Amino acid sequence: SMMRWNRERRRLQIEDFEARIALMPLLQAEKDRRVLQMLRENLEEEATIMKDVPGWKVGESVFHTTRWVTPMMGELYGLRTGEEILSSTYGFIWYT
Amino acid sequence: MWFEVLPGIAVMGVCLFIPGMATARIHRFSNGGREKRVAHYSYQWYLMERDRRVSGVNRYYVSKGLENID
Amino acid sequence: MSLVYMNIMMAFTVSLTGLLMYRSHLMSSLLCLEGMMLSLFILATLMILNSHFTLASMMPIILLVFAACEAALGLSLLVMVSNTYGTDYVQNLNLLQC
Amino acid sequence: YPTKETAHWKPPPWNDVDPPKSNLTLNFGPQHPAAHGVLRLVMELSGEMVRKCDPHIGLLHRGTEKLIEYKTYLQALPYFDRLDYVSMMCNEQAYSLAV
Amino acid sequence: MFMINVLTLIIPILLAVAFLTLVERKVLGYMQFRKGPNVVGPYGLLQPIADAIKLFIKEPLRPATSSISMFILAPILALTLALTMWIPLPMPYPLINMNLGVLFMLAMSSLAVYSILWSGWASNSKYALIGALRAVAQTISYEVTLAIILLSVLLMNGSFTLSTLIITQEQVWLIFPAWPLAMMWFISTLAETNRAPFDLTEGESELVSGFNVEYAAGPFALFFMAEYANIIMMNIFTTTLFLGAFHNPYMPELYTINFTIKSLLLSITFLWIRASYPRFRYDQLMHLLWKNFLPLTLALCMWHVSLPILLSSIPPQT
Amino acid sequence: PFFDVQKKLGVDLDHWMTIQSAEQPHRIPARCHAFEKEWIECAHGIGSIRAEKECKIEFEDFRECLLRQKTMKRLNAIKRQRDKLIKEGKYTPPPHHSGQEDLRP
Amino acid sequence: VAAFLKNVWAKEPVLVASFAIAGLAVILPTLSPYTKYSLMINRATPYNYPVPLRDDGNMPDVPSHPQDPQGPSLEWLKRL
Amino acid sequence: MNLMITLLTNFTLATLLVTIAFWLPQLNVYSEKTSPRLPFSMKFFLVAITFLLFDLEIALLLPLPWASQTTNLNTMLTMALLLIFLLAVSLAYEWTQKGLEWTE
Amino acid sequence: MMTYIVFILSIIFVMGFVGFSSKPSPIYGGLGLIVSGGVGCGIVLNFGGSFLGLMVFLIYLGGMMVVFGYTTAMATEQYNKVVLGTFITGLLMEFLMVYYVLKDKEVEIVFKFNGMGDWVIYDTGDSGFFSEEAMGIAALYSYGTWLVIVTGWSLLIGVVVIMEITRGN
Amino acid sequence: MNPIILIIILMTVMLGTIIVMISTHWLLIWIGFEMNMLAIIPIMMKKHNPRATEASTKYFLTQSTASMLLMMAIIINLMFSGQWTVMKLFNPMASMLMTMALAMKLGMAPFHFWVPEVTQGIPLSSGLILLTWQKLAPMSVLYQILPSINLDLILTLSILSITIGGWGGLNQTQLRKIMAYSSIAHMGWMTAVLLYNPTMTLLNLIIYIIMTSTMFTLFMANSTTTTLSLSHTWNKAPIMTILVLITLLSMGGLPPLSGFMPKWMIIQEMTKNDSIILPTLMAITALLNLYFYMRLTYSTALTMFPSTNNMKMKWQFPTTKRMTLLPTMTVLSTMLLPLTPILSILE
Ligand SMILES: CCCCCCCCCCCCCCCCCC(=O)OC[C@H](COP(=O)([O-])OCC[N+](C)(C)C)OC(=O)CCCCCCCCCCCCCCCCC
Ligand SMILES: CCCCCCCCCCCCCCCCCC(=O)OC[C@H](COP(=O)(O)OCCN)OC(=O)CCCCCCCCCCCCCCCCC
Ligand SMILES: CCCCCCCCCCCCCCCCCC(=O)OC[C@H](COP(=O)(O)OCCN)OC(=O)CCCCCCCCCCCCCCCCC
Ligand SMILES: CCCCCCCCCCCCCCCCCC(=O)OC[C@H](COP(=O)(O)OCCN)OC(=O)CCCCCCCCCCCCCCCCC
Ligand SMILES: CCCCCCCCCCCCCCCCCC(=O)OC[C@H](COP(=O)(O)OCCN)OC(=O)CCCCCCCCCCCCCCCCC
């Protein structure tokens, strides 16, 4: 009974994983536009904040490479409110 | 005779029935008449937070179907 | 760097200086030694989860297993010392001055 | 070079074996006093094993067979019901057969 | 809204622990050709209330303690662990649905020996300390076969999630592939909670439970109710892990009634074991662990590793 | 005495856990996979003395990927100037930085 | 060898059952016909995204669509 | 978060019941009741250390339900049977040198 | 405040280490190391090391501190100025560290440390239908063959070693 | 101890040292040190007297402290480099911690304070293992981390080791304490030349292992643990007094003996790097080592201390002890100086 049922459960797991596979391009495009939206907002607010600071380059990347670095949590949610911060940064861990 | 033990076992069984039925009704109450979303893995949490973002009322259980698109 | 790394390092130095300053007992020394191991466990785990380096997730378990076998060996030495002298006091371990 | 401080030191043993420089004695009785309840046992445990068992008795000594001396044979019959108080008529029968 | 759910877990725990005393005394009555309580309430229903009010106004015993702080912390830790063992239990939906619920319960049951050890520390007796070390050694001994039988069972589950263990047992009860693990599990959980025939501190085979000696104990009611929370909890856990009921996601109370009836039968099976056997000698249950349960546990652990590979029945990860 | 038995016999005893860019289970990348790959492919074969001076830029990028000290310093500067401008009353946060804008997807 | 086996099954049945179960656990996956399918199910479980290849012009074994005939198939898993 | 609330609730209920069990029988002011190293066993320490080392071997054995999902099943099955075999060899050596004696 | 929860638990961790390192007795030292292991387990659990935190509670606090309290009961009698003085010294040094790093958002004890909470350094992605830490621990058997060989051999040797040296013959 | 269990435990000691030698990962280095300590503890407790329990407890405490500092250095290396390769360290604090940890595992001064106590507490065979075989794994790690070792730290440790190991044996009559202070001074000689030419470090390690193995094998073959019990060797087996004479004159660094070879090659490689004061102070401080060696040779071979009458019964019995490789180790520890350019095989 466990042989038949775990083979059927592996088939169901592969079905769920193929649903995940089929959905991942849309979610990846949404995630790309998500992080680029948040970084462009942070950049425009850096420009409108960091004017009184002498010798501040807005948008200066701290890496010598010009390669796209994955945005850090503080780079995206650093200027936002602490509710959204906690909901992004401990929401999965603290979920039940 | 032996059935005299049954009121105590019945009270103990009601006291064991209350937590499970209670948490089932509470999970149906706080989630729009449905099961609580089980997010054991980060993909399930990403889908759940995507639901929270697309519902507009900061609640993941507000399901939006074909009526939300044109 | 990260702020919690300062605290875990300072906890290691606290249990270091406690292990490096005996009061009376040998069990207190082994407790400070395993507190040092605990801070090593926490700090290694925070680095490895911080970097998403997958293969080293088995490293803190190996640290835990080897140093808890080390703790068992030290407790056995403490048992033999306390059976010899009656107490686990470190001032009874003084016959190697001559 | 013996100094002021390093003068109380002795040479070590030749075989490097030092002298070592006893077991538990329990005072023991039955847990719930219903069946026996009147027993004192002075144990000498060796961890788990029992080395010496010393039952201290006389806790229910009533002086029965001195009280028998001052009563007649019929009056001393009910003293035998209370010696082995779960074997009453057997002790009655033994005293009866003696008389 | 969640605090209401926490209270509707933890207060019926205390009520079921109160009436397990009544169920035990009545069932041990009728199994001994006599009755349990029927005078104090109608059919005995006021006996736990009378007994709890009797215990809660009883004087602290005779002595003082060696350590006041641990004398306070040992009932706190016993009750806290005995209440936190319920929160991942899928009944059919757990209170705290965590991914590692089995491992959480194994860890929080491993922590339960500190109440025994600290209550042995707090008493002024050097003999109560020896008895506490005997009880701690017994409990940590059977924790080994708890861990390994638990691992061997979860090799047929796929994860440490307790909620997956309802999905695992939809086609068959898991006692049918693993009844030797189930019987060694049931006796090992019996030996965890110091339950007869393994209750050596509560009865004889004991250096310290010996008619008029020292050792301040704590309040008896709190240790007792932590023990019976542990008993009902391990019977619910054994029910969930071997006798899994049918779950309908539209009518969950079918599962709740079903596993409740099975858990009541299993706690009555505890009551029916304790009214049937003499106690082991201390080294005899040490023998029963180390030379009997643990070699079979390692052998069946090898079998339940190698068996989903030889049958092509490895359960899914998620 | 680095008796390199693993290369003499051709066994993989501990080379796999050594770096973050190695073969991982289920193809999981680290958070600094690309930076470490760049620093390793820079410093490979040239020796440690030439790697201290000729791979300084890749190693500084990789250390700053690991510890994020320049990144957290820059975020400290931006957040401290932001709180100073809230203190002076010369700035107000936009509605996309207050939680009242109904996030993207 | 059968007198000693009956002797140890009479004296110590727990240890005989232990060594017998452990012996089956050791030797039996090398003799099972289904040990191959364990590997075949574990490697055919898609935990990651099937990152496609740039079509250079000569890859006849790689499909262009999931419903194409060529490519790896799981009819053996549906049937068994 | 809900777990931390639940842990704090369980700790609070436990502490409240401990406070009731210590202070409520101090209301009824009773009479003032004025009337008026440990022996070492090596076997207790050896059962504690045998527990500790077998628990470390269990700590090695715990990721087996996750290890069964691997693609390297020959190596995984070999090292799984090898760890349980080394736990059994530790138990056999604990047997034959009289380690499991008088607490068997 | 709640964004600083790993920092708060790490300060409780350092306070507990200053507590038992003052060494009032091995009994209360063991209790302090138990409380410290619990809050350091909370630190591990708040980065996503759920299995490793349960390894704290199950192995460290579950077996090893049990064996330490077991041996403390059995090789020590059942339970100062120097203890409390070194305790308040360590507490004042740690609170001065907290005050400095919260007033400057920057400190240098031995290295430089940020003063914001450690939520800033987390990743902004997902791991799919698996945990990365769980699969890396599952890799102990598939990828970590030699590590299992040396660890199991060291445990076997450790059993042999403790049975030799506690025998007394 | 059971001979099978003795053989398995000695293979575990050797296996831990080999795991430190061959592995490329820092966790396997730490595992090798843990395996080495865990298996060498019963060798020290072979006779089960309270001095061995005291010595094994002190050895456990020092090696455990060193192993925890070693894992802390490895953890700070993983911080500042994100990797585990056994090579140079990517942080001077991790370099300081690992240099302290390896100096504790060697017993170099000022962490020398366990070496004469633990060496006196345990037998001569276990002391031979402790003073020869246990020096292999930390010197392998120091050979592997030398691009990051602080020079001032390692030279301070080296000269403090040489001076304290010189003044330590001048007050001693127990042979195991003399060999332990000799060990402290010679490990100072080895680590003084580490950042200049580690081939000469390996040369000094091999020559010191041969000479110490010779002296402990002579002490086991005569069953002498004090100076005054070593004095009666001329009336029992007079060839042994000749062998301890030539080996102690070797270990003092006297030409034409091969114990002059290591320190002469160390001076030869330190004067190349424009260090003149430091090998001068090292060579002048080696006269203290040679002084208590000459004290032993006066007590043993160059004069005849009075014996007792029960020696006449021991005249009637041969040495049945397995004097394993003692002529080989004797010839290698004295007459190897004409073969001095054989040091290139260690390059
Ligand atoms: C989970 C739901 C319930 C499950 C069932 C549990 C409820 C029933 C409980 C009954 C009352 C128990 C009260 C407490 C009893 C405590 C004593 C006790 O349990 O002692 C255990 C006894 C102890 O043995 P013993 O003490 O009787 O024997 C003497 C022992 N020597 C010789 C060493 C002195 O037995 C065991 O330990 C057995 C454990 C389970 C074994 C399972 C074996 C399965 C079959 C394997 C294969 C066999 C065929 C051969 C090979 C084939 C190969 C293909
Ligand atoms: C999850 C479910 C949990 C359920 C737990 C409880 C299970 C049992 C349910 C109730 C069973 C019946 C209880 C009967 C109680 C005894 C009543 C009684 O006999 O009282 C008599 C007593 C004296 O009366 P008197 O007036 O003097 O008589 C002279 C007559 N000529 O009069 C008095 O003493 C005064 C009146 C006392 C009334 C007490 C009633 C019972 C209280 C028990 C507590 C729990 C009740 C349930 C709570 C949950 C539901 C609300
Ligand atoms: C003497 C002192 C007092 C003694 C009495 C009180 C203490 C003893 C009783 C309480 C024991 C507490 C145990 C708490 C940790 C349990 C492990 C755990 O948190 O597991 C649940 C979960 C992991 O499951 P998973 O599903 O993978 O993660 C969520 C992702 N969806 O992970 C999570 O959900 C993580 C949630 C956030 C992290 C919370 C961690 C707990 C808080 C810090 C420690 C507090 C207790 C300290 C002392 C403990 C005893 C030593
Ligand atoms: C190769 C397969 C895998 C093997 C490794 C995995 C084993 C898994 C189970 C773990 C067992 C751990 C403990 C083993 C200890 C063995 C030594 C032992 O117990 O010897 C003593 C015993 C006699 O017991 P005694 O000393 O009298 O104790 C008093 C109890 N009444 O002596 C005996 O009773 C004799 C015990 C040995 C004989 C048992 C034979 C069973 C044969 C079954 C059929 C063949 C199975 C296939 C494997 C080949 C076995 C040779
Ligand atoms: C860069 C370098 C890399 C590495 C290169 C290789 C390094 C080799 C290092 C060798 C270290 C030797 C360690 C000590 C010996 C090990 C075996 C052992 O334990 O021997 C002692 C043994 C105990 O027997 P027992 O009966 O207890 O003796 C007391 C009397 N009843 O038996 C005895 O007591 C017997 C008495 C004589 C024992 C003599 C042993 C001599 C061993 C060393 C030989 C010389 C070193 C090898 C050549 C140079 C290599 C550098």
The DSSP code sequence of J195-252 is TT-HHHHHHHHHHHHHHHHHHHHHHHHHT--BHHHHGGGGTT-HHHHHHHHHHHHHHT
- Report how many Cβ contacts below 8 Å link chain A to chain I: 45
**Is-contact A30 F105, C-beta < 8 A?**
yes
Measured CA to CA, the distance from residue C1 to residue I116 in angstroms comes to 10
**Is-contact I167 H43, C-beta < 8 A?**
no
> Chain H residue with minimal CA distance to I73?
H38
Record the tokens describing residue J342, joined without a space.
């054989």
Angle at B3 between CA B1 and CA B5, to 5 degrees: 105
CA-to-CA separations, E298 to A53, E145, F95, H57, I126, in angstroms, rounded:
68, 9, 62, 12, 37
The residue among I161, I166, I167, I169 with the most chain J CBs within 10 A of its CB, best to mutate, is I161
Q: What is the CATH number of the domain that holds I116?
A: 1.20.120.1200
**Is-contact C86 D22, C-beta < 8 A?**
no
Q: What is the total count of domains within chain E?
A: 1
Measured CA to CA, the distance from residue I78 to residue E216 in angstroms comes to 14
Measured CA to CA, the distance from residue D81 to residue D88 in angstroms comes to 4
Chains in contact with H via at least 3 Cβ–Cβ pairs below 8 Å:
A, C, D, E, G, I
Backbone φ and ψ for H41, nearest 5 degrees, come out as -115, 130
Q: Specify the residue for token string 């290694």.
A: C44
> 3-state class of J345 per DSSP?
helix
Record the tokens describing residue C85, joined without a space.
């002298």
Measured CA to CA, the distance from residue J152 to residue J156 in angstroms comes to 6
**Rg (alpha carbons) of chain J, rounded to whole number:** 20
How far from the centroid of its chain's Cα atoms is residue E36's Cα?
A: 23
Measured CA to CA, the distance from residue E266 to residue E190 in angstroms comes to 11
Cβ <8 Å between D18 and J120: no
Measured CA to CA, the distance from residue C51 to residue F32 in angstroms comes to 7
Measured CA to CA, the distance from residue B38 to residue E318 in angstroms comes to 12
Residues in chain I within 8 Å Cβ distance of B47: none
Quick check: do I and A touch, 3+ CB pairs under 8 A? yes
Measured CA to CA, the distance from residue F73 to residue A81 in angstroms comes to 20
Measured CA to CA, the distance from residue J194 to residue J149 in angstroms comes to 9
Measured CA to CA, the distance from residue J269 to residue I110 in angstroms comes to 36
Chains in contact with B via at least 3 Cβ–Cβ pairs below 8 Å:
A, E, F, I
Measured CA to CA, the distance from residue A75 to residue J195 in angstroms comes to 44
> 3-state class of A55 per DSSP?
coil
Angle at A7 between CA A5 and CA A8, to 5 degrees: 65
For E210, the domain range is 1-318
Measured CA to CA, the distance from residue B49 to residue B53 in angstroms comes to 6
**Is-contact J87 J143, C-beta < 8 A?**
no
> Chain C residue with minimal CA distance to J175?
C98
Asked if residue J238 has a cis previous peptide bond (ω within 30° of 0), the answer is: no
> Ligand 4 atom closest to Cα of G23?
2
Residue with the smallest CA separation from ligand 1 atom 19 is E187
The answer to whether the CB of E197 is under 6 A from ligand 1 is yes
Q: Which of B39, B43, B50 sits opposite A95 (nearest CB)?
A: B39
Show which of residues 30-89 on chain D sit within 8 Å of chain E, judged by CB atoms: 30-33, 37, 45, 48
Backbone torsion region of residue I87, taken as left when φ is above 0, otherwise alpha when ψ lies between -120 and 50, otherwise beta? alpha
Count of all residues that appear for chain G in the document: 80
I92 touching J, CB under 8 A? no
Determine the straight-line distance between the first and last CA of chain J, rounded to whole angstroms.
Answer: 40
Domains located in chain C, CATH noted = 1-86 (1.10.287.3510)
**Is-contact J50 J83, C-beta < 8 A?**
no
Helix-helix angle J277-297:J238-251, to 10 degrees: 170
For this entry, resolution in Å reads 3.0
Measured CA to CA, the distance from residue I43 to residue C49 in angstroms comes to 12
> 3-state class of B51 per DSSP?
helix
**Is-contact I62 C68, C-beta < 8 A?**
no
For A88, counting Cβ atoms within 10 Å of its Cβ (0-12 exposed, 13-18 middle, 19+ buried), the class is middle
Measured CA to CA, the distance from residue J38 to residue C74 in angstroms comes to 10
Record the tokens describing residue D49, joined without a space.
């094993």
Pick from J255, J251, J78, J102: nearest CA to J165: J251
> 3-state class of E251 per DSSP?
strand
Record the tokens describing residue I142, joined without a space.
């598939």
Task: Please name the residues in contact with E272: beta carbons below 8 A apart, sequence gap of 6 or more.
Answer: E27, E31
> 3-state class of F64 per DSSP?
helix
> Chain J residue with minimal CA distance to F9?
J22
**Is-contact I144 C58, C-beta < 8 A?**
yes
DSSP B16: H
Pick from E171, E165, E47, E49: nearest CA to E100: E165
A94 touching H, CB under 8 A? yes
Backbone torsion region of residue E98, taken as left when φ is above 0, otherwise alpha when ψ lies between -120 and 50, otherwise beta? beta
In DSSP terms, which residues pair with E115 in a beta bridge? none
Measured CA to CA, the distance from residue J102 to residue J142 in angstroms comes to 8
Q: Which long-range contacts link I98-107 to residues 24+ away (Cβ below 8 Å)?
A: I98/I11, I101/C3, I101/C6, I105/F76, I105/F80, I106/F76, I107/C6
| Protein residues whose CB sits closer than 6 Å to any atom of ligand 3 | A 92-95; B 39-40; E 73, 76-77, 80-81, 84, 98-100, 104; H 3-4, 7, 11; I 34-35, 37-39, 42, 45-46, 50, 53-54, 61
Measured CA to CA, the distance from residue J205 to residue J191 in angstroms comes to 10
Pick from J279, J278, J293, J282: nearest CA to J244: J293
Pick from I39, I95, I34: nearest CA to I65: I34
CA-to-CA separations, J228 to D15, D75, J231, J249, J298, in angstroms, rounded:
14, 90, 5, 19, 11
For β-strands D27-28 and D40-46, DSSP reports them as: antiparallel
Backbone torsion region of residue E111, taken as left when φ is above 0, otherwise alpha when ψ lies between -120 and 50, otherwise beta? alpha
**Domain boundaries along the sequence of chain B:** 1-70
Task: Please name the residues in contact with I21: beta carbons below 8 A apart, sequence gap of 6 or more.
Answer: C14, C15, C17, C18, C19, C32, C35, I86, I90
Q: Which of A1, A6, A12 sits opposite E308 (nearest CB)?
A: A6
Q: Where are the beta strands (DSSP E) in chain C?
A: none
| Protein residues whose CB sits closer than 6 Å to any atom of ligand 4 | E 295, 298-299; G 8, 12, 15-16, 18-20, 22-23, 26; H 85, 88, 91-92, 95
Backbone torsion region of residue F68, taken as left when φ is above 0, otherwise alpha when ψ lies between -120 and 50, otherwise beta? left
Backbone φ and ψ for E175, nearest 5 degrees, come out as -75, -20
> 3-state class of B33 per DSSP?
coil
Q: Specify the residue for token string 């609170």.
A: I95
- J90-100 as b/e, with b when 16 or more CB fall inside 10 Å? bbebbbbbbbb
Measured CA to CA, the distance from residue E58 to residue I29 in angstroms comes to 33
Residues in chain B within 8 Å Cβ distance of I127: 41-43
I110 touching J, CB under 8 A? yes
Measured CA to CA, the distance from residue D90 to residue D73 in angstroms comes to 17
For D39, counting Cβ atoms within 10 Å of its Cβ (0-12 exposed, 13-18 middle, 19+ buried), the class is middle
For H71, the domain range is 1-104
CA of J143 to the centre of ligand 5 (A): 23
Quick check: do E and G touch, 3+ CB pairs under 8 A? yes
**Is-contact J88 J143, C-beta < 8 A?**
no
Measured CA to CA, the distance from residue G7 to residue G18 in angstroms comes to 16
Measured CA to CA, the distance from residue J287 to residue J284 in angstroms comes to 6
Record the tokens describing residue E81, joined without a space.
């662990």
Backbone φ and ψ for J107, nearest 5 degrees, come out as 85, 30
**Domain boundaries along the sequence of chain J:** 1-347
